[PDB]
Amino acid sequence: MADTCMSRIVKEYKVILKTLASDDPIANPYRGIIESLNPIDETDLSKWEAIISGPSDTPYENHQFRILIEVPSSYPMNPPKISFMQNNILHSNVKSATGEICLNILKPEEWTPVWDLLHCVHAVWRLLREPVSDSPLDVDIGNIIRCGDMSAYQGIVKYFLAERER
Template sequence: MSRLLKEYKKIQTTLSPNSTHHNNNDDDEFNQIITYLHPISTSDLTHWQAQIKGPQGTPYANHEFQLQIECPPTYPIEPPIIHFQPLSMPHCNVNFQTGAICLDILEKQHWTPAWNLMTTMKAIWILLKDPVPDSPLNVDIANILRVNDQSAYNGLLNYYLSASPSPSTTK
């Protein structure tokens, strides 16, 4: 468990908005992506909650998305289990109903212990930027992406995103 404790401390220093000593680029980048990454209760570091920003230049821009993180007792040998808030994420690699994410590094086979919660958040953020329609969980969106119908894609996503009960902390 000392690994999660260390991560927790690292996350606190990296993501704290008023912290002055994070002047390296990596930390800045994480601050651009992650607005919130915290254990649900500080007495149990296996359950976390996170919120990431939608990448600019995508329909997700100016929206924020909540994630549930669960670290198995074998973490970091085994990957954390991560879900979006159900019914909040219209994305071809996310199951809209459950929020389950299809991402290779979240599978046992491709996960390596060198990843941590922050880098994983970044990987999910990159998935928002570059959807992979060839292994879809949301077939409808993947099909629109495949035929490259940009206006339909944007329209559909905007419809979902405006209707979804996701946190309305848009700026």
């Protein structure tokens, strides 16, 4: 270890507060992308939560999403565990019920300790504009995109996100 995990997450905690405070798009690349990123309970720095806003030119437009981030004791050698909340999105690379996210950069083959949370949350956001063909956690919403039926993909997500508000 906690000696190194704590020192590093505390450094990030200051960057996140610094970064997300400013409205200047130079010092904050995350204007209207990462709306917020903070520890759930301030006393316990291993559980963070984040609000993002879906990218433009996607069915996720004009809707926010809450993302759960668990930091292990082995941070930053091992990546965090990042997930959406249960029944909060329909996305090809996302198991809607468990909220599990299959993001490449968080695999032991491709993880670099140099990457931090704002980058990781940013990658999750990037996933919504850029779905992956490779292997989906939602093989059904996955089948729609393989068959290039965008009208179906565009509507079913917009249905899901709309019916989630009422």
